[PDB]
Amino acid sequence: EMVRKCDPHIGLLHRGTEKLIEYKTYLQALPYFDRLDYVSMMCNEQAYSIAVEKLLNIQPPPRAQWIRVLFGEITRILNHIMAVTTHALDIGAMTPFFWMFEEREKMFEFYERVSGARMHAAYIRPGGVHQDLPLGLLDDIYEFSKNFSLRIDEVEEMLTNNRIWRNRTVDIGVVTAEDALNYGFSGVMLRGSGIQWDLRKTQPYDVYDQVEFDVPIGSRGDCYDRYLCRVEEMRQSLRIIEQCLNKMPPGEIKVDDAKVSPPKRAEMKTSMESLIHHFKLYTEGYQVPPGATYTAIEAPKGEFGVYLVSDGSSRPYRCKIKAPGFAHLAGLDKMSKGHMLADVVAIIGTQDIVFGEIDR
Amino acid sequence: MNLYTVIFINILLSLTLILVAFWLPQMNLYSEKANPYECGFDPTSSARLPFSMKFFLVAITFLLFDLEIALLLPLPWAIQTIKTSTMMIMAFILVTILSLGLAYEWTQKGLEWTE
Amino acid sequence: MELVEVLKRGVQQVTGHGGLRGLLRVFFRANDIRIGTLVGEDKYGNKYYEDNKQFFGRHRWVIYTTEMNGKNTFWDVDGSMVPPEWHRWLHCMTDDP
Amino acid sequence: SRAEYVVTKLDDLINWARRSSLWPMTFGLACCAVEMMHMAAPRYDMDRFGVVFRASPRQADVMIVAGTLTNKMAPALRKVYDQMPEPRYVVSMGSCANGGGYYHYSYSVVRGCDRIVPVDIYVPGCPPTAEALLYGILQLQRKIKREQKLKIWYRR
Amino acid sequence: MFFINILTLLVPILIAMAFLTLVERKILGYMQLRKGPNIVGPYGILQPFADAMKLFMKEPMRPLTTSMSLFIIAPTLSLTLALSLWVPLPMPHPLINLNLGILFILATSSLSVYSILWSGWASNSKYSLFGALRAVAQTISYEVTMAIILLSVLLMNGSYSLQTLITTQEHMWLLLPAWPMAMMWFISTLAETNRAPFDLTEGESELVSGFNVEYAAGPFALFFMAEYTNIILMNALTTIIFLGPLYYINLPELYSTNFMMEALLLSSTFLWIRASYPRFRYDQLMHLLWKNFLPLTLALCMWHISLPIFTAGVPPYM
Amino acid sequence: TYKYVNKKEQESEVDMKSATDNAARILMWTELIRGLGMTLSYLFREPATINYPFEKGPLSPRFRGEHALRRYPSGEERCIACKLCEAICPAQAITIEAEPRADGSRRTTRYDIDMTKCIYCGFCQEACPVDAIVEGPNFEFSTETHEELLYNKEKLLNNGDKWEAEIAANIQADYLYR
Amino acid sequence: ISAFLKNAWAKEPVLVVSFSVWGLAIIMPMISPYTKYASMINKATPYNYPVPVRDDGNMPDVPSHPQDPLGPSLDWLKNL
Amino acid sequence: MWFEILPGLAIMGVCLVIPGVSTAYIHKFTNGGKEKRVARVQYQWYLMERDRRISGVNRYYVSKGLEN
Amino acid sequence: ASATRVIQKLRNWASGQDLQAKLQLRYQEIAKRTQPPPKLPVGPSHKLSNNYYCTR
Ligand SMILES: CCCCCCCCCCCCCCCCCC(=O)OC[C@H](COP(=O)(O)OCCN)OC(=O)CCCCCCCCCCCCCCCCC
Ligand code: SF4
Ligand code: SF4
Ligand code: SF4
């Protein structure tokens, strides 16, 4: 029951998104990104939105950025909730998975209320945000936030100081700091080792520079320290929501640039130029200037980056997706050395892997 | 004869249920179904190949500890003995002797598994 | 004490559907002995109830028909039987039935 | 009385036991399986209908093909489907599994699990709401409720 | 008149275990904010009947790579042993009186492991083998400890027969003097039956199912027929060995009424523990019982060897 | 600003009381009986489960489900065969083959949607300049054969002579946001 | 050695209780006052019939009738 | 709610009382209204065998008093 | 709000922390499903004068 060699044979979920994008316009390709990392849904399309914004040389309005940060943190809580729980489900603690999914269901109402889909909200377009928040949805988010830190404690009681959980997780998957960078790790895997790195605090891309929060860093590299990094990030993300709720400036939700973002429904039906732009933005799509960019955002898994190449046309030329799980799973061989089969099971989760982003 | 009846009543009950399991339902057999499972993909090799364990040292010392209890289960009847002093010394020594063997197995990394 | 109060509420639910036969038609058919205000009824026969005390999600429910279009739906009850005017309300999209 | 009448009641008995003990298989491929968990989550409990998840295909009655089925995985899905003892059912879930969905025109996606396994019920959506899959499971239960397998046996 | 007595010990146990399946799904669900089965019957009372019917009407297979003889004899032993092991159980009058009652338990309880070993090995599958080669580690870990504990507990009872434990606890629970053992007995008993957190033979995460990945519906139920009647038993023994209920010879009915109260309460506790802790790794189970329990258990064995000697409390024989 | 999560502050400070606290913790399973306490609390709580057939979970007016071709109050079809709902559909689910209707109007002769290709993304309802195609709240239309998910204009008008009592209220309650 | 005894108590208590009770069971029999009564109680139990012995006129210390005061007695057992 | 577990336990609890109560009563029905005598030593078997041959009817649960 | 105040004490003590003020399930704190009509603000570039696109 000791593993001498792991050969992860990814490819069982290779839909081939990168090629299908090249035949689709920029707006048409947006839902592809909600389906890559399918547990942090609207924090993927933020990476796409930032990349297209960079090439187009536009920036979203102040209100849109806060929505993208406010909802970029609900994705973090959504994704860390699964990571803490589905990691524990394989280990054996089934109960926490059922408790925290009574909170995922609550938060999926927010997507279903800002967008119309529970999961794949095509809500964060490059030109800001698609549609404004319905009245009172901030109140519901706040009522969720107060009760939440109690929920995280209830899970924290169950599987944080148990002998069974510490023994199943401590001293396992120790990754040296030197190897973490050489293996291209990012996100919690870097921070578990001890390396201080977070794109929200070093390469800010939104109002994240005006919001205060702390980045948890672990002493040892084991799966236990990076468990605490996931649980402690939920606490800090729940701290950003307090700030975003308390400063959500009034204004527009999409850039007032009818050549990139569509105009309102009302103006479409009374003014000519608005109808033309509505007609062309949804048939050919806005044209982005030729160029190449690599924009990275701190997705909950880690460094999710998209490399858009472009030509003077409405459909991109090459869209490579830096899924954070590609490097982590490639390093799975080194993690599980002198560790039993059950430990490998406990190391798949601690990387917080979904194969939509890996295979893509 | 009361205890013979019970097990043979259980044996008949277990046989009848399993017998009814195999002849009651409708069956449709083919090679793809009866093949080994092995998580969707065809097994690369049989499961009869030598499958090395690594707790063999604890496996052997489990025998010696199993024989060891056979020398302890007579204690309830040995307490009835008129002496009560030879019994007690020969009881502590046996348990103490087991402990020292366990203690030596501890330090020599016997209970730890071969890496 | 309070135990008498809840045991009294249980009597209301078990004896608040006309009679015994009324209790049976709902216990085995909906697995829900609750009683709440009768908001309205369809032309098909669906009965819509609401109980504001209970928590969100369980404060609006239907007791379907026994027959919709010569289907004999006493047992074979499916969600696709709420007419559109009530599907909006039963799904908590509006406060106004 | 007629011997046909007794047959149907036995037919309804065997069907009933197969309706209230519909054990799926922990076989979520991708991105619909997140909503297949929510179906198992507190709000829409599946244990209510005696529906319990089991890993082994040998102990699974229904197979919820949830998520995109690719060429690399296609041989594995058919193998797993074969292992399930009959009677077995398949519940294609989501656009990627019904047809090709969003990846209908890709080079490594089998355009719908209907090409590899015979599907009993199709649950549209992307992802289907947890209720949408639950309506599918219930609509599958009403399928077993009308089998007529023992009734035809008397007619053979 | 004897054959009738078996029915009052055989049918109710089968019904009780079947209704434990519902109670498990309900108690587990409520700890997880779920309503267990409440659609099949008034409250799911018909759910176990539904599961039982489908498995015996769902095709069982004869895999090509397996061994028919052991593949079919292994489930039979599991149910035969798990049911025949209720026989010497005093409630308060056992169906048969055994002068060596608990040793009957040890041999037969240890004989149930061969069901897992032969079931795993006969079903020529890698995961089935992994389950078999974890029961060996499961049993090597607890058998040395479970036997010593019972020796220490009974050593203040005198004999080996179960029914003398009722007389032993006429005035006080045997938990109170030996609550250290009762904790070690409550874990070693949890190791047998492979109940979580020591759920490794039938592992559902490291292994797909564990020594069951090739048992289709028919013979598969025979393992659950046994895997849960063995849960009620070791709870039945524990409430007889430690939580001694009132005997009151003139009122035999009072012993069973009080017995069921504790047996269910303990049975609700195995299911309760399954709902709370994660699972061990089968090396840690081996170290847990051989580095912590075995030292203390042996030390307590000496303590109880001298206890009747330096207290003049040697129990009688007969 | 960082934050240490598993780094000991100060160590090498233990007395008999502190030593015995750890002994009591390890030697009587205090922090495992603590985990049992939380689950025991959850047993004495109201389950979140809701009887799906009889009480259905909450939704929102913007919900995106089954499609529907709308009509004006007079009865006239809204769709005018502008064909930019199949231009933006990122699955090529829609097909239109419109021809003149012989009364002069620009109307469709084919509006088939493949619900097995559709991904319920909502781009087609925000592209239509007449709100001809919408997405009603009907999330429950699972079928027993692949074919009934290949919607055609006749089905899409049926869904739209059915859910208008709902679709109109939903649009009337979120068009200002759009 | 105070730190070592309590440091082990703080980190590995199970191996200290085992050693403590191990020494406690060895020493307790020597100190108890009832240790010598374990043997006498096991001499009281008459598992086999007490065979009588003939009288030759020189057997005074053994009793004649079972309930007579000139033989061994168990009056210390009733009050133990 | 949680009290819905009681139906699972109520008729389960009855099923764990039958095996205990039934054996005690079945013994008294077969053994003439007396508890089933238990022979754990050869001395007791000689006594039951004695009672089996003392009584005219070859059964050890019929006890002859001083009437001889 | 139907815990009977004795189970409310049991679950409150067992959990270790007061939770009747922090319940999961929502009762009457949620915004009413129906909301009054909004009027979303019109952003910049609707100036109607001195707004030539060649500048921004
Ligand atoms: C007067 C002189 C004579 C006095 C003599 C007596 C001296 C005092 C004796 C006090 C001690 C009593 C016996 C102690 C037994 C427990 C032994 C123990 O320490 O537990 C072992 C283990 C330790 O944890 P571990 O992480 O391994 O520590 C070392 C890590 N390197 O911890 C574990 O095993 C935890 C894993 C098991 C968890 C199982 C879950 C249990 C859930 C609680 C249920 C309890 C129910 C008990 C009641 C049952 C009623 C029948
Ligand atoms: S149908 Fe939609 S939700 Fe389901 S797997 Fe495909 S993209 Fe994901
Ligand atoms: S919802 Fe999206 S995928 Fe579906 S038809 Fe409309 S545009 Fe196409
Ligand atoms: S539905 Fe709307 S967008 Fe599509 S062709 Fe008709 S009018 Fe144009």
Side-chain angles (χ1 to χ4, degrees), chain A residues 163-164 167, chain E residues 175 179-187 190 197-198 238 242-243 266 269 273 277 280 288 292-293 296 300 303, chain F residues 26-29 32-33 36, chain G residues 11-14 17 20-21 24:
Chain A
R163 288 96 185 180
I164 298 89
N167 303 348
Chain E
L175 179 61
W179 59 266
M181 270 62 57
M183 293 183 286
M184 269 151 296
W185 175 256
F186 191 81
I187 279 172
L190 202 62
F198 319 105
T238 295
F242 291 108
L243 288 74
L266 275 299
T269 298
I273 286 153
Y277 304 142
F280 270 94
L288 189 88
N292 305 337
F293 285 9
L296 178 49
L300 287 169
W303 178 243
Chain F
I26 297 169
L27 191 62
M28 293 154 94
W29 313 335
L32 285 178
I33 306 294
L36 291 203
Chain G
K11 297 296 289 183
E12 182 65 26
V14 168
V17 169
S20 77
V21 65
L24 210 64

Side-chain angles (χ1 to χ4, degrees), chain F residues 14-16 18-20 22-23 25-27, chain G residues 2 5-7 9-14 17:
Chain F
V14 287
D15 50 351
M16 294 299 291
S18 179
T20 305
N22 301 12
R25 160 181 84 152
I26 297 169
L27 191 62
Chain G
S2 177
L5 188 144
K6 96 193 174 65
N7 179 307
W9 185 240
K11 297 296 289 183
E12 182 65 26
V14 168
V17 169

Side-chain angles (χ1 to χ4, degrees), chain E residues 8 30 43 91 93 99 247, chain H residues 1 4 20 22-23 35 38 40:
Chain E
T8 44
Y30 279 108
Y43 285 120
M91 311 155 97
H93 302 144
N99 224 337
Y247 178 35
Chain H
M1 291 285 268
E4 285 203 342
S22 165
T23 45
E35 214 160 1
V38 175
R40 55 179 53 265

